[PDB]
mmCIF file with all atom_site columns, C-alpha atoms and ligand atoms in Angstrom:
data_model
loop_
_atom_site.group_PDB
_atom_site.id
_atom_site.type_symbol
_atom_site.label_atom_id
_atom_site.label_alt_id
_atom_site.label_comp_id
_atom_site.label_asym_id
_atom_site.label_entity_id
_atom_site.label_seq_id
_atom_site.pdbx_PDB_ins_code
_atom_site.Cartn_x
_atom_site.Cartn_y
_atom_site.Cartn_z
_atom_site.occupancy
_atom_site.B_iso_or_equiv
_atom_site.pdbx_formal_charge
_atom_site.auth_seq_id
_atom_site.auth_comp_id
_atom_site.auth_asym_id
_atom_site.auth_atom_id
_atom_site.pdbx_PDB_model_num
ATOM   1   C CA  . UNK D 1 1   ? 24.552 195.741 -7.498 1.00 38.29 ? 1   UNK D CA  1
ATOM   2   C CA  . UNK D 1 2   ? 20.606 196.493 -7.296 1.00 37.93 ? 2   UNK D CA  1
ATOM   3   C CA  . UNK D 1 3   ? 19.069 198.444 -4.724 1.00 36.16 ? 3   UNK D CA  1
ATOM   4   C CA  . UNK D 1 4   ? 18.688 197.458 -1.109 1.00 37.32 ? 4   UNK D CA  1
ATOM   5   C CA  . UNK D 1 5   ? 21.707 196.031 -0.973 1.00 37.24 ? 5   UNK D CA  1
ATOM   6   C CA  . UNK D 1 6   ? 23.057 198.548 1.738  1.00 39.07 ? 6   UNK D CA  1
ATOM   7   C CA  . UNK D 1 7   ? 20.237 198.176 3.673  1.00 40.80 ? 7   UNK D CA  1
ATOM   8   C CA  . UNK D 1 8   ? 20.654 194.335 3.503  1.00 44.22 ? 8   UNK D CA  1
ATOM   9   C CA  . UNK D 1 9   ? 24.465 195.165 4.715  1.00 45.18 ? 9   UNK D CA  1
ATOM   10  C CA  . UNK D 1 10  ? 23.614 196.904 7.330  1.00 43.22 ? 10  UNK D CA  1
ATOM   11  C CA  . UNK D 1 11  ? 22.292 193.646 9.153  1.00 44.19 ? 11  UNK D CA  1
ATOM   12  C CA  . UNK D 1 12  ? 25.853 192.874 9.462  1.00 43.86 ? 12  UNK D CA  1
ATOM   13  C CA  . UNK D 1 13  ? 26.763 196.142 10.765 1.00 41.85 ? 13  UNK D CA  1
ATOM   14  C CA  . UNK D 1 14  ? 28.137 195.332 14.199 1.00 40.46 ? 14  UNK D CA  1
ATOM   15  C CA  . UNK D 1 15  ? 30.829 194.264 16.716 1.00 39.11 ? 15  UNK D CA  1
ATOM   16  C CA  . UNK D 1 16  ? 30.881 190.434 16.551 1.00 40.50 ? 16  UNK D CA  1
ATOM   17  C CA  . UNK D 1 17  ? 32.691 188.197 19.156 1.00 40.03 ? 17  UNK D CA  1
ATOM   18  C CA  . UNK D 1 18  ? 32.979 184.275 18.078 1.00 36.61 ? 18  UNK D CA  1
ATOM   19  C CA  . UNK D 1 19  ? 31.184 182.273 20.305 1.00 37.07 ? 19  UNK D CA  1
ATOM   20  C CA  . UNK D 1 20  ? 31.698 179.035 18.858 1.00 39.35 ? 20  UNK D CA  1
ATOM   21  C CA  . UNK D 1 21  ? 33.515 177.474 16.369 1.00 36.38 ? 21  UNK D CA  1
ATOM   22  C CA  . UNK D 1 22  ? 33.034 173.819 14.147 1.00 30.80 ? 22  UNK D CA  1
ATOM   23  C CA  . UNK D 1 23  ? 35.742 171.822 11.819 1.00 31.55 ? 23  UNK D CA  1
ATOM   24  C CA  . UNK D 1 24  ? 37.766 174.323 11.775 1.00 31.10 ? 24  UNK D CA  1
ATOM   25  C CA  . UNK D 1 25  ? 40.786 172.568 12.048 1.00 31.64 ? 25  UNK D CA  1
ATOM   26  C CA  . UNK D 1 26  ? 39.991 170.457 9.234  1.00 33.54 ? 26  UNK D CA  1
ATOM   27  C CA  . UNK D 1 27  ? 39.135 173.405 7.087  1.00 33.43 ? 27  UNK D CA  1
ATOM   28  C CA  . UNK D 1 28  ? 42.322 174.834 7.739  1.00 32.06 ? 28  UNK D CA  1
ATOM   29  C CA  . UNK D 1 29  ? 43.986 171.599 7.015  1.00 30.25 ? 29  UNK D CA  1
ATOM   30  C CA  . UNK D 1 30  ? 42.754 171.670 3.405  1.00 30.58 ? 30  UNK D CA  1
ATOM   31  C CA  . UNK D 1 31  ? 43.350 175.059 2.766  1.00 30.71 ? 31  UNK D CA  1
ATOM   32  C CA  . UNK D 1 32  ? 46.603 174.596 3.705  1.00 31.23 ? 32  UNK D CA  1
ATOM   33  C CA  . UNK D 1 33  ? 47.766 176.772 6.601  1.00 29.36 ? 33  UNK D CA  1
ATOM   34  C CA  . UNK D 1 34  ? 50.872 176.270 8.210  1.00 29.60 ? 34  UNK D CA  1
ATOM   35  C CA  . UNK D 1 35  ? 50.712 174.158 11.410 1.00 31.45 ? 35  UNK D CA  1
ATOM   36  C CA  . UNK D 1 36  ? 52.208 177.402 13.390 1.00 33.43 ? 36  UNK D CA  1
ATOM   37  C CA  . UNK D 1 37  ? 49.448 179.226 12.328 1.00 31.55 ? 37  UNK D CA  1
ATOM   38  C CA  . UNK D 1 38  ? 46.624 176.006 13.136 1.00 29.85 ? 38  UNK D CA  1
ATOM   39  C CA  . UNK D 1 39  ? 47.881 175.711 16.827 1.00 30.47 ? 39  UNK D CA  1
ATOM   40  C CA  . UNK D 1 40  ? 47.283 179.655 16.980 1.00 29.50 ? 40  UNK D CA  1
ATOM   41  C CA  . UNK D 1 41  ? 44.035 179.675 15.012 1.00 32.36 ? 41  UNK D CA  1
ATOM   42  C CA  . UNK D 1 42  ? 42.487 176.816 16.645 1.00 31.24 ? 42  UNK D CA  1
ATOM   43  C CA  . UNK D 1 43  ? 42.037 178.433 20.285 1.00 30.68 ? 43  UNK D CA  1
ATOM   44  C CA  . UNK D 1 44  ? 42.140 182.259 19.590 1.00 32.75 ? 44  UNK D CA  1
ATOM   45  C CA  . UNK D 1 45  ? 38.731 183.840 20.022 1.00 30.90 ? 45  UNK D CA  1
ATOM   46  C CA  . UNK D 1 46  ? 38.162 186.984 16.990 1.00 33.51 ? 46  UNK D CA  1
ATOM   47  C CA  . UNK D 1 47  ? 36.186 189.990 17.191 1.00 29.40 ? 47  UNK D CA  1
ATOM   48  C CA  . UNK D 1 48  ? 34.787 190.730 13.785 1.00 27.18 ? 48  UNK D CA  1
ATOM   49  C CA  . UNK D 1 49  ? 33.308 194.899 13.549 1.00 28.69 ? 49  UNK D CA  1
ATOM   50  C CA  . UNK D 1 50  ? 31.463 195.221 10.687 1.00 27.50 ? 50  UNK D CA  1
ATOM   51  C CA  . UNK D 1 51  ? 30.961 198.806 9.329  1.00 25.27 ? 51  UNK D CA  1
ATOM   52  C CA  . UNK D 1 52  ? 29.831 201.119 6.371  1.00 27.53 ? 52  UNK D CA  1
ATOM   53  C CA  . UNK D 1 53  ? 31.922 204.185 5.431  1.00 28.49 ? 53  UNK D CA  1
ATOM   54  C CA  . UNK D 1 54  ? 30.482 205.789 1.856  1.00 29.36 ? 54  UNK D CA  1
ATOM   55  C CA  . UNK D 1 55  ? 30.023 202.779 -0.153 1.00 28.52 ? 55  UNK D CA  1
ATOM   56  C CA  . UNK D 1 56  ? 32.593 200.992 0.923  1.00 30.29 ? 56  UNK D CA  1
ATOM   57  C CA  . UNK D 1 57  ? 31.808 197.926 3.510  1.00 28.70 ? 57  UNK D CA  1
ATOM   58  C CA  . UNK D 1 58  ? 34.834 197.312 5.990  1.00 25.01 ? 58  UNK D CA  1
ATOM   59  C CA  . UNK D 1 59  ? 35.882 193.661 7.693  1.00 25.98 ? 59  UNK D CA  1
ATOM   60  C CA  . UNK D 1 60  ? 37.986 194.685 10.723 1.00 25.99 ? 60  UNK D CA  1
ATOM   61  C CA  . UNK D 1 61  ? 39.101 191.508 12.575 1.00 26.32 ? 61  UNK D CA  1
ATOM   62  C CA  . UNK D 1 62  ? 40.861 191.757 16.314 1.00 28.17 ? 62  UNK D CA  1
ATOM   63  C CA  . UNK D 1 63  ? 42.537 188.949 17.744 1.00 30.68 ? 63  UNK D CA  1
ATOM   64  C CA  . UNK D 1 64  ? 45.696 187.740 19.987 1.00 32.53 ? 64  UNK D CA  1
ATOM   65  C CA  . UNK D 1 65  ? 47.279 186.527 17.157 1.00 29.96 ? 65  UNK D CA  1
ATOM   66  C CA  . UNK D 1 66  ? 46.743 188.648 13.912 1.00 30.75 ? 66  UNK D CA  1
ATOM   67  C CA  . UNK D 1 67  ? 44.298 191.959 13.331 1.00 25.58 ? 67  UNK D CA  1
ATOM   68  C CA  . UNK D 1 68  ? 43.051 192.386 9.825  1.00 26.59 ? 68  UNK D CA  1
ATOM   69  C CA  . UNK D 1 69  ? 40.889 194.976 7.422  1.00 22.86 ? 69  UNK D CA  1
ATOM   70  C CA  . UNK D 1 70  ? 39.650 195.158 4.286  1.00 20.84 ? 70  UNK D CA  1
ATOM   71  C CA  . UNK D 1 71  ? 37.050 197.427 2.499  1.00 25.11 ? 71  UNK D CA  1
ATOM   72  C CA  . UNK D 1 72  ? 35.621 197.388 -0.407 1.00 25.66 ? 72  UNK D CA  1
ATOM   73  C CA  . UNK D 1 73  ? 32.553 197.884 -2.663 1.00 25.78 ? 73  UNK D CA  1
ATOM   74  C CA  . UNK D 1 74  ? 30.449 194.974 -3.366 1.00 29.04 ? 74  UNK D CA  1
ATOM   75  C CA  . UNK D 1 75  ? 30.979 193.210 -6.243 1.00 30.43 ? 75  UNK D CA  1
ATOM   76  C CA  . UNK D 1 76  ? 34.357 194.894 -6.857 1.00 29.43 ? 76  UNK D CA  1
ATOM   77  C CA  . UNK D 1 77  ? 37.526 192.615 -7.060 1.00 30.60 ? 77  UNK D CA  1
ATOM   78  C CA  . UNK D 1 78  ? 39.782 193.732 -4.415 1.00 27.96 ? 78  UNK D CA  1
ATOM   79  C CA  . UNK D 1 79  ? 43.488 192.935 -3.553 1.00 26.94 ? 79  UNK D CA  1
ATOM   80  C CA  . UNK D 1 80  ? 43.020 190.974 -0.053 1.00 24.93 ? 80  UNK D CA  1
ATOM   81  C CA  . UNK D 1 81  ? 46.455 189.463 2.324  1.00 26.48 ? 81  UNK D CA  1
ATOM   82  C CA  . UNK D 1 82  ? 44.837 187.109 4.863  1.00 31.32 ? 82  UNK D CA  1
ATOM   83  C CA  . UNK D 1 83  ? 45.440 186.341 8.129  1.00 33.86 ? 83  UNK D CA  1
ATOM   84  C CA  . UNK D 1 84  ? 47.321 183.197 7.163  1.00 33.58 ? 84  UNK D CA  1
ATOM   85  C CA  . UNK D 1 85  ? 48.922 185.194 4.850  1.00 31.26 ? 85  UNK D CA  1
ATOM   86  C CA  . UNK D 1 86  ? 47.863 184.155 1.185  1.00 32.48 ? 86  UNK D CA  1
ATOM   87  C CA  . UNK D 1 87  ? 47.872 187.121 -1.646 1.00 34.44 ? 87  UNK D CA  1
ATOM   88  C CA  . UNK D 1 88  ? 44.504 186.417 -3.208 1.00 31.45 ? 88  UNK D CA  1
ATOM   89  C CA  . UNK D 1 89  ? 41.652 188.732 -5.607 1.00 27.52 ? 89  UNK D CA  1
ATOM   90  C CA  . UNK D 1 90  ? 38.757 189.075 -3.181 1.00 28.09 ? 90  UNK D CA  1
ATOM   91  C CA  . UNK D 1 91  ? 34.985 189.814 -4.287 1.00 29.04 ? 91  UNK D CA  1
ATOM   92  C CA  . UNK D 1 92  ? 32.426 190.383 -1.240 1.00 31.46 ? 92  UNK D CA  1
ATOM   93  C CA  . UNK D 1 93  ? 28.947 190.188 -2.898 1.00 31.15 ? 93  UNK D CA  1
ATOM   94  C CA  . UNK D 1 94  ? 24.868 190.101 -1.787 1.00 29.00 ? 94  UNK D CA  1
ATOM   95  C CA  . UNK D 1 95  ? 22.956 187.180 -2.090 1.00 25.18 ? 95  UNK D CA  1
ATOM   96  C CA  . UNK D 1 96  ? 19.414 187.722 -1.166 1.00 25.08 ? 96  UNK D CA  1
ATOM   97  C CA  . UNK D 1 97  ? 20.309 188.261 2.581  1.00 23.94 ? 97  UNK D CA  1
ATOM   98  C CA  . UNK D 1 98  ? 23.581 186.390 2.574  1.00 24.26 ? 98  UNK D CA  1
ATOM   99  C CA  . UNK D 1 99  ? 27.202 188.067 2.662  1.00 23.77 ? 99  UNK D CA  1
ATOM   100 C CA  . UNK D 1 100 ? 29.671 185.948 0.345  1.00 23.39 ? 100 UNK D CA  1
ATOM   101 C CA  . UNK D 1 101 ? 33.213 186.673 0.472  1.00 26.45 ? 101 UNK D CA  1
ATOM   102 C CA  . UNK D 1 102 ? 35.038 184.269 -2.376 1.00 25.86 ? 102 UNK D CA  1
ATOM   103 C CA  . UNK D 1 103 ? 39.021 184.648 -2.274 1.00 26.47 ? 103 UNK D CA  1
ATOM   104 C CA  . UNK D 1 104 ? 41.372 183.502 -5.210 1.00 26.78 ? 104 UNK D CA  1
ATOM   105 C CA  . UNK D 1 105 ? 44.612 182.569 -4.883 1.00 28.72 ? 105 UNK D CA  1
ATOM   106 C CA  . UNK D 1 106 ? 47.510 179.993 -7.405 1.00 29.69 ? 106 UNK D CA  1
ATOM   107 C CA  . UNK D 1 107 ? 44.394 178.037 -9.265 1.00 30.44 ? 107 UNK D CA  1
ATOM   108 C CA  . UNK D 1 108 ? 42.182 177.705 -6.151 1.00 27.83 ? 108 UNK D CA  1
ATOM   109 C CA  . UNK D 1 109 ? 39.196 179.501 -4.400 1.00 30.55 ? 109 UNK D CA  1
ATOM   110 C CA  . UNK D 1 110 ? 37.335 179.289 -1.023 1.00 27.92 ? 110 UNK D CA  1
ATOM   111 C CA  . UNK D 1 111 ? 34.079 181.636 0.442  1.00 29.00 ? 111 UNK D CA  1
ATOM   112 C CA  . UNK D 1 112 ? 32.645 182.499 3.243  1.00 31.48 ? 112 UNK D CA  1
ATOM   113 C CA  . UNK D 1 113 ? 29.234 182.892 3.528  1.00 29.02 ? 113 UNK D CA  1
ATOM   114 C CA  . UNK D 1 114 ? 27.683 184.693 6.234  1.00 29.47 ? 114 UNK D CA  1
ATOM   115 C CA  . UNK D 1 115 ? 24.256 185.265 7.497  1.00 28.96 ? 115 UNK D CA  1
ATOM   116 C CA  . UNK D 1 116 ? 21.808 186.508 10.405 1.00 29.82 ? 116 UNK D CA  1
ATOM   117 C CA  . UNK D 1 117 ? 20.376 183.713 12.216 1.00 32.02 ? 117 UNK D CA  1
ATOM   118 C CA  . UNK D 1 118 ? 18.783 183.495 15.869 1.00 31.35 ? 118 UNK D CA  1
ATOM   119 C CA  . UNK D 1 119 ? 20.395 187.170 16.403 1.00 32.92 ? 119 UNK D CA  1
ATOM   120 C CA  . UNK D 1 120 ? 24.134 185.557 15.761 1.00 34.65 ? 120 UNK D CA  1
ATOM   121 C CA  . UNK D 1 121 ? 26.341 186.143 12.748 1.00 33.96 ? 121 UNK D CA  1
ATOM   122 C CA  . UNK D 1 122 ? 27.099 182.639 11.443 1.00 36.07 ? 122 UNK D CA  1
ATOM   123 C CA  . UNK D 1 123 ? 29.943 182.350 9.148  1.00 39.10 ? 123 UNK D CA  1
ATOM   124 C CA  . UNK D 1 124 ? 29.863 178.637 6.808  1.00 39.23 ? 124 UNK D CA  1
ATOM   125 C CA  . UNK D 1 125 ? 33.601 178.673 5.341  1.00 39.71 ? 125 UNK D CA  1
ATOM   126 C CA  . UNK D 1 126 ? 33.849 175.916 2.187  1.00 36.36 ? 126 UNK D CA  1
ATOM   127 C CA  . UNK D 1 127 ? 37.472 174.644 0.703  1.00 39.74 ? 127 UNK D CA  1
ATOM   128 C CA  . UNK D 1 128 ? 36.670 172.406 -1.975 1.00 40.19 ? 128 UNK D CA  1
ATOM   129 C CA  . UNK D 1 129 ? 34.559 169.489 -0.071 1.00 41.58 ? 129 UNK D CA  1
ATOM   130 C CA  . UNK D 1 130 ? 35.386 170.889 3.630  1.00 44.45 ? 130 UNK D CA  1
ATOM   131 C CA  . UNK D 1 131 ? 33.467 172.910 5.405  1.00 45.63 ? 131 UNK D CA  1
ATOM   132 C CA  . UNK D 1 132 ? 33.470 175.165 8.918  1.00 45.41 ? 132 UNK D CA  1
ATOM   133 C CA  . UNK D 1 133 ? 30.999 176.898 10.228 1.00 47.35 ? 133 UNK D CA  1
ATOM   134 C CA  . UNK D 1 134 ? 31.592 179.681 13.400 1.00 49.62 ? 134 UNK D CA  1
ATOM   135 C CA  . UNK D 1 135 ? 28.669 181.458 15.396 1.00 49.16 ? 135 UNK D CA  1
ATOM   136 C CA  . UNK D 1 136 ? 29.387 184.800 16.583 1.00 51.52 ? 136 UNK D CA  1
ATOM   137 C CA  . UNK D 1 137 ? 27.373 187.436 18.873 1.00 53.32 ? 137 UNK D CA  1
ATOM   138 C CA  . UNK D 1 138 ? 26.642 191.091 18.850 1.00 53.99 ? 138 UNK D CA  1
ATOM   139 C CA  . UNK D 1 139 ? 28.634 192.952 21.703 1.00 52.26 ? 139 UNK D CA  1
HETATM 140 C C1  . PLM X 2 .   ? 42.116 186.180 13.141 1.00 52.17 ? 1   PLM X C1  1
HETATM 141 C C2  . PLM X 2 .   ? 42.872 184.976 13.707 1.00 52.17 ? 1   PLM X C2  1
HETATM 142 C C3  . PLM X 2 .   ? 42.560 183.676 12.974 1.00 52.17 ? 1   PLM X C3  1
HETATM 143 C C4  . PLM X 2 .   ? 43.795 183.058 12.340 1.00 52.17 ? 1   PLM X C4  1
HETATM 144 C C5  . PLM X 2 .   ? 43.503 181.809 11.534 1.00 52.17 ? 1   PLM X C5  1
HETATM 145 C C6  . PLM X 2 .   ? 44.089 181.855 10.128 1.00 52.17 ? 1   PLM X C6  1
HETATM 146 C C7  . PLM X 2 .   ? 43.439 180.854 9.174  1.00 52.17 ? 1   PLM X C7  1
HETATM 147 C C8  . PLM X 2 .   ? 42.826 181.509 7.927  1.00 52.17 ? 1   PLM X C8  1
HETATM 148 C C9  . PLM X 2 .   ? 41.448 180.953 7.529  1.00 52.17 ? 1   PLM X C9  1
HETATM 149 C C10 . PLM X 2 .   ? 40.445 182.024 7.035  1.00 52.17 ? 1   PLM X C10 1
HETATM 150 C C11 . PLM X 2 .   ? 40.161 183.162 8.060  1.00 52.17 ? 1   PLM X C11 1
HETATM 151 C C12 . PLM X 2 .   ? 38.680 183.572 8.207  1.00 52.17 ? 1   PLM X C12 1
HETATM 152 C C13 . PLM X 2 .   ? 38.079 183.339 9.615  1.00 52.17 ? 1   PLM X C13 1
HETATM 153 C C14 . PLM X 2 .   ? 39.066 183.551 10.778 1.00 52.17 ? 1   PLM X C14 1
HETATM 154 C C15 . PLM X 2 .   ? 38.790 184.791 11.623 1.00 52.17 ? 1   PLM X C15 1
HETATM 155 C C16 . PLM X 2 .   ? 37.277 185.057 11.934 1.00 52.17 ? 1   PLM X C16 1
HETATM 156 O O1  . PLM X 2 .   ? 36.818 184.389 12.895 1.00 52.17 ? 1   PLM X O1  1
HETATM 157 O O2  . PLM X 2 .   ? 36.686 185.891 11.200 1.00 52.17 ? 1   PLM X O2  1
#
């Protein structure tokens, strides 16, 4: 909403390969993906591009298992399908210099929060009391 906020986006703005990953099995656990999908989503290895184009923000993810995008304004509830394939209202939002992505789906929410630290992207995902947290690098 106030001003800066692009400018504060544009931190993100970049190609982004994951270079590690923590509990995310467990997080996916609790969320509730399939176990299909948790064998895939354990070992594959996303690239995350990060862009602006107008006002709109856009979340383009690459991967050997499923390639996603959304855009949208922040602060604007958005239609989002995931990559585990739940139907949810999206919001992406500023906070301070943080990046938080909150997803609603049947009674139940989960965010993502990420932020610049040490140069990386790192992304702390939160389902009720379990939490991830993946590191990714500029390319
Ligand atoms: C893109 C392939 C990953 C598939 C795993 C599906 C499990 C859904 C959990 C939320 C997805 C958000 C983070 C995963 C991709 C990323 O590294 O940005």
């Amino acid at each position: 909403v106030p001003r800066g906020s692009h400018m504060m986006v544009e931190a993100f703005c970049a190609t982004w390969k994951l270079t590690n990953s923590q509990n995310f099995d467990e997080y996916m656990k609790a969320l509730g993906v399939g176990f299909a999908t948790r064998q895939v989503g354990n070992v594959t290895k996303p690239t995350v591009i990060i862009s602006q184009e107008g006002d709109k923000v856009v979340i383009r993810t690459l991967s050997t298992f499923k390639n996603t995008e959304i855009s949208f304004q922040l602060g604007e509830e958005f239609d989002e399908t995931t990559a585990d394939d739940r139907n949810c209202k999206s919001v992406v939002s500023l906070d301070g210099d943080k990046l938080v992505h909150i997803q609603k789906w049947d009674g139940k929410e989960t965010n993502f929060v990420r932020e610049i630290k040490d140069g990386k992207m790192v992304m702390t995902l939160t389902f009720g009391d379990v939490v991830a947290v993946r590191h990714y690098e500029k390319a």
